[PDB]
Design a protein around this motif. Structure first.
Motif, short mmCIF file in Angstrom:
data_model
loop_
_atom_site.label_atom_id
_atom_site.label_comp_id
_atom_site.label_asym_id
_atom_site.label_seq_id
_atom_site.Cartn_x
_atom_site.Cartn_y
_atom_site.Cartn_z
N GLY A 193 -16.43 -7.89 1.67
CA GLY A 193 -16.29 -8.17 3.09
C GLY A 193 -15.83 -6.97 3.90
O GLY A 193 -15.25 -6.04 3.34
N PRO A 194 -16.06 -6.95 5.24
CA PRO A 194 -15.61 -5.79 6.03
C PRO A 194 -14.16 -5.87 6.53
O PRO A 194 -13.74 -4.98 7.28
N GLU A 195 -13.40 -6.92 6.12
CA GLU A 195 -12.02 -7.17 6.57
C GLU A 195 -11.06 -6.02 6.25
O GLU A 195 -10.30 -5.62 7.13
N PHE A 196 -11.09 -5.48 5.01
CA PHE A 196 -10.18 -4.38 4.67
C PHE A 196 -10.53 -3.12 5.49
O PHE A 196 -9.64 -2.49 6.05
N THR A 197 -11.82 -2.82 5.63
CA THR A 197 -12.30 -1.68 6.42
C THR A 197 -11.79 -1.80 7.86
O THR A 197 -11.21 -0.85 8.37
N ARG A 198 -11.98 -2.98 8.49
CA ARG A 198 -11.53 -3.23 9.87
C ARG A 198 -10.00 -3.20 10.03
O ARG A 198 -9.51 -2.61 10.99
N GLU A 199 -9.26 -3.85 9.10
CA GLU A 199 -7.79 -3.91 9.15
C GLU A 199 -7.18 -2.52 9.01
O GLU A 199 -6.28 -2.18 9.76
N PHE A 200 -7.68 -1.73 8.05
CA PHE A 200 -7.18 -0.36 7.87
C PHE A 200 -7.51 0.53 9.05
O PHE A 200 -6.71 1.39 9.42
N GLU A 201 -8.68 0.32 9.68
CA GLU A 201 -9.13 1.12 10.82
C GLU A 201 -8.08 1.17 11.92
O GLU A 201 -7.93 2.22 12.52
N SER A 202 -7.33 0.06 12.14
CA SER A 202 -6.32 -0.07 13.19
C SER A 202 -5.09 0.79 12.97
O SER A 202 -4.40 1.08 13.95
N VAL A 203 -4.80 1.18 11.71
CA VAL A 203 -3.57 1.92 11.36
C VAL A 203 -3.81 3.32 10.80
O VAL A 203 -2.83 4.03 10.62
N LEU A 204 -5.06 3.70 10.45
CA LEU A 204 -5.35 4.95 9.75
C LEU A 204 -5.08 6.22 10.51
O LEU A 204 -4.68 7.20 9.87
N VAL A 205 -5.31 6.25 11.84
CA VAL A 205 -5.01 7.44 12.62
C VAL A 205 -3.48 7.71 12.54
O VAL A 205 -3.08 8.84 12.25
N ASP A 206 -2.67 6.65 12.67
CA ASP A 206 -1.22 6.75 12.56
C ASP A 206 -0.82 7.20 11.15
O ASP A 206 -0.02 8.14 11.01
N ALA A 207 -1.41 6.56 10.10
CA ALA A 207 -1.16 6.83 8.69
C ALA A 207 -1.42 8.29 8.31
O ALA A 207 -0.53 8.92 7.75
N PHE A 208 -2.61 8.82 8.66
CA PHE A 208 -3.01 10.19 8.38
C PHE A 208 -2.15 11.21 9.08
O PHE A 208 -1.72 12.17 8.44
#
Ligand code: CL
Ligand code: CL
Ligand code: CL
Ligand code: CL
Ligand code: CL
Ligand code: CL
Lengths: 127, 127, 128, 128
Positions: free
Chosen positions: B72-87
Motif C-alpha cells: 500500500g502507499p500509506e507508509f510512503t505518504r506518512e513518511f513524506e510528511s516528516v522526511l524533510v524534517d528528519a533529513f
C-alpha cells in the motif's frame, strides 16, 4: 618476520572487528626494532586509505603508543613526528563526507524513484 | 500485536547488526494499519535518539518505504510528511559531532598523559 | 559526572564496539575507582542481559579498565579477578548457543520477502 | 563507472555492513545487468575469499540486487538462482567453523598482555 610488504598487507586487512586493532598492535610491538619504517608505512597507508578506514588507523596508533611504553619510548617518539599531520588529515576528511551516507541515501531514493524529483530536491536542499 | 510501547522498545533495541533494520521493517509492515502512529513514534524517537543511533532510523525508513510499496502507499505518504524534517535533523547532527571520535581520542591522550600538554594543544589546534 | 549505578547502566547501554567508546567509558570508571565493587557488579549484571552481539565489548572494556587502573591502585584488578572467568565463560557458551542467529535472522527475512519459490528456502534451511 | 571484473572486485573489497554501502553497490550492479553472469561469478569468488566477519554482507547484497532487479528484467534472478544456495551453505559452514574466532583472538591478546598470572588464562581457556 617483519617486512614493509607484510605490514602493508596487515594494514590493508585492518577491519572494524573488535580484535583487529589490538592483534595488529601485538605484531607491531614485537617488531618495535622497526618503529621508524612502521610509522612511515602507517602514515603513507593512512593517507592512501579510504575516508571510512582512516579513523581505525588512529585507533591503531593509540593502541601501539599506549602498549609500547612498557617496552621502549621509540613508538611514542616516532609517532610524535607525524601525529599533527595525521590528526589534521583525519579531522578534515571526517568533515568532507560526513553526510556521505545521507548523500548516498538520496541517490538511492532518486534512482529507485522512492519519491518524485521535486520531493528529492527538497530533501537535498534541507542538507 | 501492535502497541506504541512495543514500538518504542523495538526502536530502542534497533542496533548495528545487519538483520536489525529488515527484521523491524517486517513487523512495521505487518502492522501497516498503524502507519500514522508508527511514523509519529519513529520521528519522536529519532529526535530523542543519540547522534550515533540517528542514521539507522533513516535506514529503517528507507527499508520500510521501499518494501511497503507492494502492500500500500500509506507508509510512503506518512513518511513524506516528516522526511524533510528528519533529513535536515540528521544532516546537521552528523556535522555537529563528526569529529566526536577525534575529540574523544585527544581527551583519552590528555587524561592518560600519552603525550605532554603542549603536544596535545598542537593536536587540538590542528582540528 | 557524579557516580551512580543508574548513570553506569545508561553508559553501558550506550557502549559501542568502537575503541573511543570503550576507552572513554574506561576513563570515567577509573576516575570513580572508589566504587570498583559496585561498578564490577553492575558491569557483570549488564553483560548477562546484553544482546549476544554486544557481549564481547564488555570484555574489551574490562581489560582496558584493569590495564589502565594499575597505576591508580589494585581495586579494579582485585574486583574483576573474582568475576572475569565467569564473565568470559558466559560469552563462550552464548557465542556457541547463538552462533546461527544471524543466518537464522537472514533466512527469516527471506522467508517473508524472497521472490524465489518455497523449495529454495527449504534448500537454504537444509544447508544448516 | 564502466563495467569491469577488476572495478567489481575493488567495490566488493570496499563493501561494508552498512545499508547505504550494500544499496549503493546494488545500484551499479543493476545498471550493469548486461553482465549479470560475470557479476554473480565474481561475487561468489569474492564471497569465498572474504573474511568470516565480511561474508554475511555479500548475502544482503545478493538479496538487494535480486529484489530490485525484477522491474528491470529476469537476468539477476536467473543468475543468482544457481549459486545462492551454495553461497548460503558456505556461510552456514564457515560461521560454525569460525564461531570461537573472536573469543580466541581476545584470549590471544590477553595471553600476551594481561597482568593476571598464568593460571587465569588457563581458567579462561577451559571455559571454552
Ligand atoms: Cl622490508
Ligand atoms: Cl604488546
Ligand atoms: Cl497503542
Ligand atoms: Cl514486508
Ligand atoms: Cl585512566
Ligand atoms: Cl536499482
Amino acid at each position: 618476520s617483519f617486512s614493509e610488504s607484510a605490514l602493508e598487507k596487515k594494514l590493508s586487512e585492518l577491519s572494524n572487528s573488535q580484535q583487529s586493532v589490538q592483534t595488529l598492535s601485538l605484531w607491531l610491538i614485537h617488531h618495535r626494532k622497526h618503529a621508524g619504517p612502521i610509522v612511515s608505512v602507517w602514515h603513507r597507508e593512512l593517507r592512501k586509505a579510504k575516508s571510512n578506514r582512516k579513523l581505525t588507523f588512529l585507533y591503531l596508533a593509540n593502541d601501539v603508543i599506549q602498549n609500547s611504553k612498557r617496552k621502549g619510548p621509540e613508538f611514542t617518539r616516532e609517532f610524535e613526528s607525524v601525529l599533527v599531520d595525521a590528526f589534521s588529515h583525519v579531522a578534515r576528511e571526517a568533515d568532507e563526507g560526513c553526510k556521505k551516507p545521507l548523500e548516498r541515501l538520496l541517490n538511492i531514493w532518486q534512482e529507485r524513484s522512492v519519491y518524485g524529483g521535486e520531493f528529492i530536491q527538497q530533501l537535498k536542499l534541507s542538507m
